Each structure stands twice: as structure tokens, then as C-alpha cells.
Amino acid sequence: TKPTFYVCPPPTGSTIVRLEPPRTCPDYHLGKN
Amino acid sequence: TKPTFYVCPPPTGSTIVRLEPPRTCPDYHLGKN
Amino acid sequence: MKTLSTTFISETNEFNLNQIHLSQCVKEEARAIINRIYTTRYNSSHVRTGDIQTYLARGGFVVVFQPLLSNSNRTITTTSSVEFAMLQFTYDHIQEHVNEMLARISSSWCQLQNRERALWSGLFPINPSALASTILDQRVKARILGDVISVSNCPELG
Amino acid sequence: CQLQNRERALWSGLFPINPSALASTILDQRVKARILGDVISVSNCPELGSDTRIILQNSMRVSGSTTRCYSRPLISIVSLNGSGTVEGQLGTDNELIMSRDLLEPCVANHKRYFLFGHHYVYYEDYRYVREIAVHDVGMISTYVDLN
Amino acid sequence: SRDLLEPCVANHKRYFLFGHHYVYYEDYRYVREIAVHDVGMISTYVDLN
Amino acid sequence: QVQLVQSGAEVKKPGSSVKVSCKASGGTFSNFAISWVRQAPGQGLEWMGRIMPLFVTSTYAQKFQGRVTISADASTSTAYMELSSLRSDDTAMYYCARDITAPGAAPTPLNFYGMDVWGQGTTVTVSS
């Protein structure tokens, strides 16, 4: 096929992001009396 | 809520640790004659 | 009842055997049988927890149940099959086991993701564009502006 | 088991780059770690208690010098019991260093965001500019779902 | 070869793996040694029972 | 703990100054951003300017910018709040508040932990 190249312009502070904090894990209440 | 900051004093060689070596994986002998 | 592979389903209420014709046998017969079973098997391991209880199971059965604890007028019509109760036992078993395993898979998956977040956070300074392109499923160019990441889209060369 | 045994290689190869973050994740507890050759020496980080006022300084520039500037914002830990005033700088993940030993060649067109508690304080050309809450910055997630 | 040199740091303390032991060098001199099985471990392994 | 004190019961005629002082007790006075508030009997409260450490600027409020002048010493641990106007509306209970800060701090509301400690109250009257 045809190779595709990219062009990456220098970023700008407009779109800033962050890593999401760690998700809490559900406690499974499996178990009966 | 209230932000919590930390204070990290410089470590000391007292408590040294290491990464545990890779665990062996169990061979599941599922299969009958 | 794991020895029979049978699960009976009663109500939470007791059944009064006085509503049934000619039910004088059950009380004392079951008392004798339960006392023999207790004295021969659970004499030292467990202890009784009250008098015998009588429940009307589903499908027309009467369960005379004696609760143990470790040292730590009408007539009843019974069906001609206990296949439904074996089905109930089998479904309960498979369902409980598969649910425990699914819960374990889920807890481990959450812990593993929460740990791989540390690798992702520690490797962004080294190569921000590659990690941001993988995470965003789209080719971008990223910079580390201190504690944040500033991304920008990379249009393909026409 | 195979996947864990393979991710051990990533963990072992990334400890030199950032020992404190990886050791805090592994130990499920905030620590400070050093690589002492082939081992890791950890140390617990006690949380900054009350009666403590952390002040954020306006400029990141070294006094008098123009070719040298600080990398992270400077803070003044003012005391309330009369114990004086500690002067350090703002570390990472709300870590408050008790010294100002993180310097850098003073770059041109400087723009950085720093985490000060629940806010991202913004410094442009080594001076305070504005601030934005953490909940306002957009997120990307490294988490894969399993429902 | 001996092509791994460094600017000689002050207050030098390092542990090196020599087979089944962690040989300890303080200020660029041998000091002591400790078996690998004696050093405390941290595990990157998540369990799935 | 820290203590701030004003002059006391003051009676001044309209056409002069007041020159209210505010003596401190501790805190080194290098971590004091002295603010001044007031309210006349029957009014809520008001704000009359803030003098930050390295006391040279003394940013004032909107309504008293042409009237009041606030200064400090950093060696005597005092703060003065002269008005020199006394327009007959200057009849309130002038307070000497204080916020914790440091010299060279950023102009950010993240560094404001409230006016924790206060003064006594002056109870100034402007009438003959």
C-alpha cells in the first residue's frame, strides 16, 4: 500500500490534560449467612 | 476538602529492599485418559 | 444437601404440622432420627441450637431441621420428581463458583490497572508523544508543561 | 502469571528513572526511595501536620542571577508555634522539599503548571500568573475497563 | 573491560549483586556482604487465585 | 499566643488625624499582613487596606484610597492607620486584623488563610 507520513506542529497550552487518578476498586460482598 | 502536603526526609541505608524474582507459573494438569 | 445434590426452598416461616391430618408421627420420629444422627456424628464437634424446626419445602416436602453450631385441616401433595431440586442445587453451585471467580478477576484487574498507572505516569517524561498517541488512540504531539500534558493533533501529510 | 512476569521487567527498568513514585505505588504508601546500586533504600514520608502555613512565592528566579532560575516554585513554610520559617520548594505530588536545590538554566518562553494541593498553579516566565482547580483540567485515562 | 567510570562522588554507598550475595562498597572500598535471601523484598506481582 | 492591641478609647474632633497603633507580641512580624476593618454602630463591617511584609506599598480599599494611610515598622512590631480626614463619617470600631504570609508571596487567594488573630477595638468618635 501507500505509506502515510505525518506532520506534527508544535503544541500550545490550549489543550492541557492529566492522568486520571487511580480508580477505587469495588468490594464484592459475595457471601451469605 | 483540605489539601495534604508531605515532607520526605532523606532516606538511609537502614531499610533496603529489592524486586522479588519472577514467580513460577503453575502447570495445570487438566486432561483425562 | 451436598450428599444428595438437592436444594429445597422453604419460606422463612415455620410450618405447623397441626394443619395436616394424621401428622402425629413426624415430631417424635424425626426427634429420634436426629438424636441418633447427632450422637453418632456431631457429638463432640458441634452443639444444638434449639428444638427441631419444621418447614414446608417447595414441591410438597416437609423438612424437620435441627440447627447446629460448632464449638467455636388439609393434606400435603408431593410431586413425583426431585429433578427440579437437583437442578436448583446445580445452578446454585455453578452460579456461586462462577460469581466468586468473576469477582476475583475484577479485583485483580482493578489492582493491576492502578499499578500500571504508575508506569504510565513515570514514563511520560521520557516519551510524551508516543504514550499520548497510545492513550488517545490518535496521533498527537505532547509536551510536559510541569505537572500537566499539552497535546496537539498531528494532521496526516496529504 | 506470564503477564506479571513480563511487567516485572518494566518495573525493574523504570525504577532508576523515578524510584519514589514506583516505590510509593508498590508499597501502597508514600515513601522516598534511592537506588543504592542494585538495591532500593526506602524511607517513610510523614504528612505535614496542622499549625503549618505553606506560602507560595511569586517568582522562580534566583536573586540577582539572570542565567540561572529555579525549576519548581518556592515555598515558605511559616510556623505558628513560633518555630521560625522553613524555606524550601514545591516538589511533586504535593511533596514539600525543605531546600531549594532544584535549579535549572533559565529557559526562554517559560510556561509550566505545578500541583499545589487541589490546584494547578501556573507560572509563565518564572512568575505567578493564575491558578486552576484540579477538577477543571481535562483527563486522560490509562485504565482499561472490565465490566 | 573497565569502561564504566564516574566522577568520584562523596559519601558513597552502594550494594552490588555478586552471584547470590549483595557485596557492599562504602567510599569505593569493600565493606561487607549479605546473602540475597536476607534482603527484604517488594513484589510487583498482583495475585489471581 | 500572639496579641494585637490598638490605642484605646479615642475621641477626636473632625479636622484632624487619629493615628491608631497596633502593637504585636510575637510571630517575628515578618509573617504579618496587617489589614484594617471597621463598622459603625449599626453597620456590618468594612475593609480598609492591607499592608504586606516588607512594608512599603500598603494597598488600600476603594472608598478610603484618598483618605487613609497605613504603615508598619518591622522592628517595633506595630502598625499605624492614620486617616487625617475625619469627615464625621469616621465613627466606627477600628480593628487591626492580621493574615499569615511571607515577603515575596504570590498575589494568590491560595495564600489567604483568613484573618486568624485580631485586635481589641478602638471605638473612635468624631463629633463635638
Add this chain to the structure above:
Amino acid sequence: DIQMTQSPSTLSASVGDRVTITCRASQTISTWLAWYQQTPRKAPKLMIYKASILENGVPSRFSGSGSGTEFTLTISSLQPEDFATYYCQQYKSYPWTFGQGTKVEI
């Protein structure tokens, strides 16, 4: 922002009531509000800063919430030392214009 409103003047209550002293703002104070307390023969004293944070020396029966132009001071378990005037304080841009009234709870 530069001008803030308040709650009714009195809000009479008794010992053991949950009273809210809601005061509002003009130009979206982003959690930069402080609450005070001035008894008739005292000086005001800090109760809440950052619209949610208590000051050292204040019982944890006091609370605070709200993020923009809508902030409440909800007290619970009103012990007999809550019969005082309360004030909202704005620190987002000078001048720091004070707010609330709420003369007394009797």
C-alpha cells in the same frame, strides 16, 4: 464578588437546631469565601476559610459548602455558644468586601 448578599436578619433558633446562614455572591467566587463570628462584646474570629475548611480551635460541628455564588454555613448540634453575628468575607480580588448580617439567634 465586589458585593455580596446574605440571609435574613435574625434566624431565631434554640439549642439543638440545624441552622443555615446562606449568603450569596455576584461574580462566581471560586471557593474563596471566609466566615466569621462576632459576639456583641468581642472581635470577630475566623470560623471557615476556603468556604469549607475549619480553623484550629473551632469545633467540628461547624460546616461549610458551596462553590460558586452560593455558600452555606450549616451548623448542627447547636451548643449554647452560637448566638452571635456572622459575616461572609470575599477574597478573590481587592477590595475584600465583607458580607453577611445575621445579627443573633435567640
